[PDB]
Amino acid sequence: EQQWQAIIAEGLGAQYGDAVPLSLLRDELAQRLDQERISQRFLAGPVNICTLMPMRSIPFKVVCLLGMNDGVYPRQLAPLGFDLMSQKPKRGDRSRRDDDRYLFLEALISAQQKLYISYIGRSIQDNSERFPSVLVQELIDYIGQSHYLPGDEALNCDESEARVKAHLTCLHTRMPFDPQNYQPGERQSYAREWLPAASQAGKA
Amino acid sequence: RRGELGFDDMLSRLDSALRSESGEVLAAAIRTRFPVAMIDEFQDTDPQQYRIFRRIWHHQPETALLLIGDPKQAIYAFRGADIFTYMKARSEVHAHYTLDTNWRSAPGMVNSVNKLFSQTDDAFMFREIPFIPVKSAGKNQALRFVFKGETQPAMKMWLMEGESCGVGDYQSTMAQVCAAQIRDWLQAGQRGEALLMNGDDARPVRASDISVLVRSRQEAAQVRDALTLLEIPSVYLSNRDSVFET
Amino acid sequence: VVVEEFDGYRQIWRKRGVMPMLRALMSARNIAENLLATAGGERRLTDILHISELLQEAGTQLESEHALVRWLSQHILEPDSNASSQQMRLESDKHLVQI
Amino acid sequence: AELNAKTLQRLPGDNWRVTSYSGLQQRXXXXXXXXXXXXXXXXXXXX
Amino acid sequence: AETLDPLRLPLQGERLIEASAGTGKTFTIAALYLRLLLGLGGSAAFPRPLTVEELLVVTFTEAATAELRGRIRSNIHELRIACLRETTDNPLYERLLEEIDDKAQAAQWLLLAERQMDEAAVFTIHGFCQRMLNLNAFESGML
Amino acid sequence: MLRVYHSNRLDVLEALMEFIVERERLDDPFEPEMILVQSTGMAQWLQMTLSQKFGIAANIDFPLPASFIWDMFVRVLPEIPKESAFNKQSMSWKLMTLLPQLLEREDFTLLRHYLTDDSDKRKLFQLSSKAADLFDQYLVYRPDWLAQWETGHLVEGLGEAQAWQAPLWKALVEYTHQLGQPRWHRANLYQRFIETLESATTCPPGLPSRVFICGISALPPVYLQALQALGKHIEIHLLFTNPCRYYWGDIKDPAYLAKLLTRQRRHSFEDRELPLFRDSENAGQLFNSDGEQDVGNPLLASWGKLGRDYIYLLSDLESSQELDAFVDVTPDNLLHNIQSDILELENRAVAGVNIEEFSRSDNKRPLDPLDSSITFHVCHSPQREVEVLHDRLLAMLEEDPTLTPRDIIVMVADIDSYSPFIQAVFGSAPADRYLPYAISDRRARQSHPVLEAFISLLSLPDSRFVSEDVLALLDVPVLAARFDITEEGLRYLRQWVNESGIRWGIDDDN
Amino acid sequence: QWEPVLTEWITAVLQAPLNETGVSLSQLSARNKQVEMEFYLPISEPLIASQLDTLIRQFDPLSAGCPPLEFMQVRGMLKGFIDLVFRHEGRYYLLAYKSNWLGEDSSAYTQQAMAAAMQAHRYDLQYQLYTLALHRYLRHRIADYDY
Ligand SMILES: Nc1ncnc2c1ncn2[C@@H]1O[C@H](COP(=O)(O)OP(=O)(O)NP(=O)(O)O)[C@@H](O)[C@H]1O
Ligand SMILES: [Mg+2]
């Protein structure tokens, strides 16, 4: 009732006389009922999961980023196309893409200890290829061009580069029971539920 | 009524939109948005598609258009594509350009195909689709494949024995034989005997590098059932079957 | 005893959702291991996990525990064509014949 | 090979929570359960 | 029919390029794409250099769009690296660099393109008309 | 005065605000304290941080800059209504009037081809909504235009399709006059607002003591034009984070660098400005007629294109007093190397410009193999990916003694695509393993079924009344409750409907 | 069905005198009003029930009723909305509205039964907590504040 009557009230207060078809309102109200979001529990303290919101930047010790696959991020909403602003921009114009591109910088500046970036390399279903977002691409580029692993202190620019970029990138496996996960080392899985599966200890 | 849309309906609606008197404004925007367009795999083209691309870029200066296609390759007629409209475009374009050399496959594979399509005159039986001989590259000259020592010729046609053959017999036998040949390459692949070699370089033949091309689904299942019977795990990449049916 | 364990499963089902339940069942029954022991069962296990992953995606949007069992049947009847419910590749561990 | 899963030692995390007074009354598990309403009820037979 | 040099092709009006299988048809699209970004080929060159978002490439399969997108990304990257090193170990890039006039400004445009690569225009037809309608709606008479 | 606080990181700025509240205490107790935020999360954080220092935080007003600025016109100027006369909502319903009247005006023809085709009015409404949205945007970011079209003049050097927008705008001003609703609106108002504060007594009634701008890195130029002229009275503090301590903004004219050669005083020690004085102006940096070229760090140049324009605004304020507190970060971990290289604005990328440079690799910075500071992880599905994330979170907690899961955040492109998976893996985790989580920005669905069933009820006049579709209305236990069909009996209406041959629409008439 | 039923009742509310000072809600100028204060009150070391309700019950007559309140160990922030805060005679007040009561109309609200329901819904701890909040906020805002 509140939303509906809010719509109609918006109408009346605007002085709109003509008869109206129902299919106009039915599809307004659909938009009105799901418009709401619940952010309540944000900083309650349970580890925080949430989408990247402009102008919200909170210093943290650990920042995780998921779904950096190319084309999923940044997010795309074209300008309306008869917009005049998008034709001749001035300084302070805001456009969604530049918003995302700037956020990915904020989150970098904000993480005070561990930054964590992830993206889907290969579609699990067809083993197709997927790609990282262009931002992640630029980042790994910058890392690889600014650093070298201590192993080879004289090799080459590009070779030490692809070397590092190989050292920073981890390829996690396709299935949880893949025993590679559990081989003792640095990356090792805490899930003990798949362990006997990976050990292949079961009887047929 | 619902304000929905669909694949064929998309293309159709853009064609109609241009078609309409107002559509000329529309085209002007696109000639602004993309004052070039490079269409690839153009040998597959629809009447609608070509009507569009033409109506946009056939005229006006400063816009380019690049059509890229091999008319020999157009297999999609079932999906609505048509060769004849390609030949039409080929007619209305003044300039043609040809790329000479095959970079893809072995120096043997080039000569094999060329030999097989030079057997008759006008193999493709469209006067407008002449075959021409192509030349392998120099990067590929050293390519060779070795199975139990001495190299295996680039192409091997497996001839069935007997006089009359029905489709069923053919599908059983040939699938089976394919499988038997496939596991042999594999077993020789785990011992490192059979190798894909560019010059001195090599690599054993993993079950990955083998591909089996089939025309239809039932065919493919016919391949797998026999091929898994030999304990070779196999996938079918075109499988559209849904999990819930299992 | 069996009746009991399933009765605890319903509890996990109501509180924690679906996928947690099927997880608990797979661990306790040891099925996720016994299939991998069995020949070919690797494929079967992939199908099971996949289906579960879908029971999440439809599991949230539907509030009822029961309307989900409602839903699953309806999809068992009409498989459709659609992309996400299409089978995943069985294993990428071993190189495969790409038919 | 041999293989094993690591296991956490410290608690995953202690209690830090932002709550209202409502997050205080909560509910009671045991002999006494706390509710706003009174369980005891009396019927009225006057008509 | 004339034989083709990627760097000799005039990019004006309609042009058809035909050749048999494995002939590198897809492979050339990269070269022409770069050429378009820098406005090269002189007489055969397009009037003015273009921006990544102004180049339309339309391919047959959704997968092919992904691949070609990637390859173009890589090639732009490598070519930029070369422009800064002024030498390169690959022949096609080497010829491009012989054609290029000012290598620094070239590297700048390339960098900008490389950034723009997120929204770079590659589609299929059914993926093209999709966008285009939702882009200019009035004309198309769409919601 | 308008004060501007530049910082590396927020935790400094939040503490500065603490200090400002501390030294000076508003006379009136009940006057709430104005702090501008662009979101709710930022507010909630600021509270939790203040109340921890002071011991409590309350009466802190957290409006949006637009909402605030609007609130303020009401205070400086009489006659203004509390909510304005132009909205992203109402303007829709007014345009949905004007457009039919204005068809075939010899101008709007382009539209006339769009609409007149056919409709149940759906199209007209879509177009109304979008036009409204634009005019709002114009109001904020381009009020000069609406001043033009309000007259009937046109703007030169402005893209096509203006011609059908402007007369619609004029028609809107005039029409909403005819309805008599208040003429005043954000576009024509803010100018007379700036002007009335321009010449005034320093004490206009009703304005709050001191105002804070915290965590908002983007404001339209109009608001800064406003707050600048406001500074003559109320003290405003701009809390602004920017990564680069130097000036990474642009340059307008080579005569505009003179004004930008002023200095940023530092509270901690002494005044400071950008490096290499006038030589960095010529340089390659500020080049041609365009903005900054090299921009030092390649990352910042590419990513920061927003903060560019904004920091270019803030430095354009005449009366502004800017001071800068930057906490240097000491390079150790890879991450700190990056955040550093951004901060001091240097390029650490080894190009391999020449071969003698290109051979030896050691002039890069060395990288410890042990560093998890920045890590990249390739997974297969969203499922598998989140599941790996979980493990790495645990490992990170175990590896450092003080880490509170409160200190960890997980961000997503679109949270609704990843919700079910998160809820799956964090939910199924065993006790010892289990760590708590909270998901924010989920689309808020409090009751799924009633809403859906109701919308379908609005859909009746079309609806074909397929049997299963009608029964789905009974699925909802309330719509059954009204009709007192129990769940047990509803098993019967499943077979009966099936068996009794009920399939097509409801009546013979239908 | 409500409007004529409400508009009367509200006046009865605003006109009711309060406490011993006899203040009418009507007499409050918007300068002395503060509407719906949200506060955040930090709790530093874990707050244990029994280590509190003894302090409560000790000085509180109202906490004699019902068992000791039980809540798990908690450390963190505490939230709340003061319905209304206003100052009269240079003296602050704390005001909270409650509604409920499906069953009754008449004197089922008395000095006794109000205190009964307070002890039933544990508004005791609630008002004490607010008073702590308002206390700290005044101690903060008012130079030379005394409880
Ligand atoms: N000019 C070139 N120099 C070096 N390698 C090349 C060149 N052109 C093509 N190749 C390689 O040759 C193979 C075939 O290239 P491709 O672009 O697929 O041709 P195509 O015409 O698109 N084949 P298809 O799509 O089946 O017609 C690829 O594996 C390329 O790397
Ligand atoms: Mg190709």
Q: Check which CATH number belongs to the domain holding F265 and give it.
A: 3.40.50.10930
Q: Work out the burial of residue A81: count CB atoms within 10 Å of its CB; fewer than 13 is exposed, 13-18 middle, 19 or more buried.
A: middle
Please tell me whether residues F198 and F57 are part of one structural domain.
Answer: yes
Partner residue facing D16 (CB), from G76, G126, G129:
G76
- Please tell me the distance from the alpha carbon of residue F361 to that of residue F343, in angstroms, as a whole number: 24
Is G73's Cβ below 8 Å from some Cβ in D?
A: yes
**All residues at 6 or more sequence positions from G41 whose CB lies less than 8 Å from its CB, including other chains:** F51, F56, G77, G78, G79, G80, G129, G132, G133, G136
- The A-side interface with C (CB below 8 A) comprises 122, 124-127, 174-175, 177-178, 193-194, 196-197, 200-204
| Ligand 1 close to Cβ of residue E91 (< 6 A) | no
What are the E-state strand segments in chain G? 17-18, 23-24, 33-47, 74-88, 91-95
Q: Work out the burial of residue C70: count CB atoms within 10 Å of its CB; fewer than 13 is exposed, 13-18 middle, 19 or more buried.
A: exposed
- Against chain B, the chains showing at least 3 CB pairs within 8 Å are C, E, F
List helix spans (H) across F142-181. 143-151, 162-178
Q: Which of residues 116-155 of B touch E (CB under 8 A)?
A: 132, 134
User: Distance from the CA of A110 to the center of ligand 1, in angstroms?
Assistant: 45
- Please tell me the distance from the alpha carbon of residue B45 to that of residue B90, in angstroms, as a whole number: 12
- Vertex C22, ends C19 and C27: CA angle to 5°? 125
Q: How far is F349 from chain A (nearest CA, A)?
A: 5
Please tell me whether residues F97 and F49 are part of one structural domain.
Answer: no
Angle of helix F305-314 relative to helix A96-110, nearest 10 degrees, comes to 90
- Please tell me the distance from the alpha carbon of residue B173 to that of residue B179, in angstroms, as a whole number: 10
Chain-centre distance for alpha carbon B121: 23
Please tell me whether residues F161 and F211 are part of one structural domain.
Answer: no
Closest ligand to E29 CA?
1
What is the sign of the dihedral through the CA atoms of F379, F384, F390 and F395? negative
The closest residue, in CA terms, to atom 11 on ligand 1 is B103
Closest CA to E125 of E64, E75, E82, E77: E64
Q: Are residues A204 and C87, on separate chains, in Cβ contact within 8 Å? A: no
Name the 3-class secondary structure at B143.
strand
Is F122's Cβ below 8 Å from some Cβ in B?
A: yes
Chain C residue with minimal CA distance to A196? C33
Strands of the sheet containing F2-7, edge to edge, are F60-61, F33-36, F210-214, F235-241, F2-7, F321-325
Q: What 3 state SS string does B18-79 have?
A: HHCCCHHHHHHHHHHHCCCEEECCCCCCCHHHHHHHHHHHCCCCCCEEEEECCHHHCCCHHH
Yes or no: say if F310 and F217 are a contact pair by the CB < 8 Å rule. Answer: yes
Rg (C-alpha) for chain D, rounded Å, is 24
Q: Are residues A146 and F412, on separate chains, in Cβ contact within 8 Å? A: no
Chain B residue with minimal CA distance to F118? B1
Yes or no: say if D18 and G79 are a contact pair by the CB < 8 Å rule. Answer: yes
Say how many Å lie between the first and final Cα of chain G, rounded. 46
- Please tell me the distance from the alpha carbon of residue A94 to that of residue E31, in angstroms, as a whole number: 35
What are the E-state strand segments in chain E? 2-3, 13-18, 56-58, 122-123
Angle of helix E62-85 relative to helix E91-99, nearest 10 degrees, comes to 60
- Please tell me the distance from the alpha carbon of residue G122 to that of residue G64, in angstroms, as a whole number: 12
Rg (C-alpha) for chain F, rounded Å, is 30
Please tell me whether residues F312 and F205 are part of one structural domain.
Answer: yes
Yes or no: say if B185 and B205 are a contact pair by the CB < 8 Å rule. Answer: yes
Yes or no: say if A110 and A57 are a contact pair by the CB < 8 Å rule. Answer: yes
Q: What 3 state SS string does F192-227 have?
A: HHHHHHHCCCCCCCCCCCEEEEECCCCCCHHHHHHH
- Please tell me the distance from the alpha carbon of residue C85 to that of residue G57, in angstroms, as a whole number: 62
- Please tell me the distance from the alpha carbon of residue B126 to that of residue B130, in angstroms, as a whole number: 8
Name the 3-class secondary structure at C28.
helix
User: Distance from the CA of E24 to the center of ligand 2, in angstroms?
Assistant: 7
- Tell whether omega for the bond before F182 is within 30 degrees of 0, i.e. cis: no
- Please tell me the distance from the alpha carbon of residue E128 to that of residue E121, in angstroms, as a whole number: 9
Yes or no: say if G104 and G77 are a contact pair by the CB < 8 Å rule. Answer: no
Token pair of A69 as six digits: 């696959």
Site to probe by mutation for ligand 1, drawn from B72, B104, B211 as the one with most ligand atoms within 8 Å of Cβ, is B104
The experimental resolution of this structure, in angstroms, equals 3.8
Please tell me whether residues F300 and F217 are part of one structural domain.
Answer: yes
CATH number, domain at F128? 1.10.10.160
Name the 3-class secondary structure at C69.
helix
- Give contacts of F405 with chain D, Cβ < 8 Å: 12-13
Partner residue facing E55 (CB), from B36, B62, B134:
B36
The closest residue, in CA terms, to atom 5 on ligand 1 is B103
| Ligand 1 close to Cβ of residue E70 (< 6 A) | no
- F336-371 b/e (C-beta count within 10 Å ≥ 16 → b): bbbbbbbbbbebbbbebeeeeebebbeebeebeeeb
F292 bridge partner residues: F286
| Ligand 1 close to Cβ of residue E22 (< 6 A) | yes
Yes or no: say if F10 and F217 are a contact pair by the CB < 8 Å rule. Answer: no
Closest CA to F395 of A194, C20, A179, D9: D9
Where is the binding site for ATP, in residues of B? 103
Closest ligand to E91 CA?
1
- Please tell me the distance from the alpha carbon of residue A140 to that of residue A146, in angstroms, as a whole number: 10
| Ligand 1 close to Cβ of residue E64 (< 6 A) | no
Closest CA to F150 of F178, F131, F169, F175: F169
- Please tell me the distance from the alpha carbon of residue G17 to that of residue E33, in angstroms, as a whole number: 83
User: Distance from the CA of E28 to the center of ligand 1, in angstroms?
Assistant: 8
The Cα-based distances of G145 to F22, F23, G34, G141 in angstroms read: 16, 17, 18, 8
Name the 3-class secondary structure at G77.
strand
Q: Are residues F110 and B25, on separate chains, in Cβ contact within 8 Å? A: yes
Yes or no: say if A48 and F440 are a contact pair by the CB < 8 Å rule. Answer: yes
Token pair of F26 as six digits: 């508003």
Token pair of G77 as six digits: 């922030």
Rg (C-alpha) for chain A, rounded Å, is 25
Please tell me whether residues F169 and F209 are part of one structural domain.
Answer: no
Q: Are residues A188 and D7, on separate chains, in Cβ contact within 8 Å? A: no
**All residues at 6 or more sequence positions from F189 whose CB lies less than 8 Å from its CB, including other chains:** F73, F77, F80
Kind plus residue range of the DSSP H or E element containing B200: none
Angle of helix B47-57 relative to helix B83-92, nearest 10 degrees, comes to 20
- Please tell me the distance from the alpha carbon of residue B39 to that of residue E127, in angstroms, as a whole number: 13
Q: How far is G109 from chain D (nearest CA, A)?
A: 15
Yes or no: say if G74 and G46 are a contact pair by the CB < 8 Å rule. Answer: yes
User: Which pairs with CB-CB distance under 8 Å and at least 24 residues apart come from G13-19?
Assistant: G19/G93
- Please tell me the distance from the alpha carbon of residue B233 to that of residue B207, in angstroms, as a whole number: 8
φ, ψ (nearest 5 deg) of residue C12: -55, -40
What is the sign of the dihedral through the CA atoms of D20, D24, D25 and D29? positive
Yes or no: say if B13 and E140 are a contact pair by the CB < 8 Å rule. Answer: yes
Q: Work out the burial of residue F138: count CB atoms within 10 Å of its CB; fewer than 13 is exposed, 13-18 middle, 19 or more buried.
A: buried
Partner residue facing F58 (CB), from G31, G38, G143:
G38
Please tell me whether residues F137 and F276 are part of one structural domain.
Answer: no
User: Distance from the CA of B122 to the center of ligand 1, in angstroms?
Assistant: 26
Domain that holds residue F289: 1-78+188-326
Token pair of B162 as six digits: 């007997």
| Ligand 1 close to Cβ of residue E90 (< 6 A) | no
Please tell me whether residues F308 and F194 are part of one structural domain.
Answer: yes
Partner residue facing A198 (CB), from D3, D8, D17:
D3
Chain A residue with minimal CA distance to C26? A193
Please tell me whether residues F102 and F208 are part of one structural domain.
Answer: no
Please tell me whether residues F71 and F6 are part of one structural domain.
Answer: yes
Chain-centre distance for alpha carbon F83: 22
CB atoms within 10 A of CB A161: 23
Tell me which amino acid residue A32 is. Answer: R
| Ligand 1 close to Cβ of residue E85 (< 6 A) | no
Please tell me whether residues F70 and F210 are part of one structural domain.
Answer: yes
Is D8's Cβ below 8 Å from some Cβ in A?
A: yes
Q: Are residues C89 and A126, on separate chains, in Cβ contact within 8 Å? A: yes
PDB experimental method = cryo-EM
Partner residue facing A74 (CB), from E118, E136, E138:
E118
Please tell me whether residues F214 and F314 are part of one structural domain.
Answer: yes
- Give contacts of G73 with chain D, Cβ < 8 Å: 15
- B105-124 b/e (C-beta count within 10 Å ≥ 16 → b): bbbbbbbbbbeeeeeeeeee
List the CATH code of the domain at C1-89: 1.10.486.10
Which residue carries 């930022």 as its tokens?
A: F42
Name the 3-class secondary structure at G60.
coil
Site to probe by mutation for ligand 1, drawn from E9, E23, E27 as the one with most ligand atoms within 8 Å of Cβ, is E27
G47 bridge partner residues: G74
Yes or no: say if B88 and B131 are a contact pair by the CB < 8 Å rule. Answer: no
Q: What 3 state SS string does D1-47 have?
A: CCCCCCCCCCCCCCCCCCEECHHHHCCCCCCCCCCCCCCCCCCCCCC
Closest CA to F182 of F39, F327, F84: F84
Q: Are residues E138 and F110, on separate chains, in Cβ contact within 8 Å? A: yes
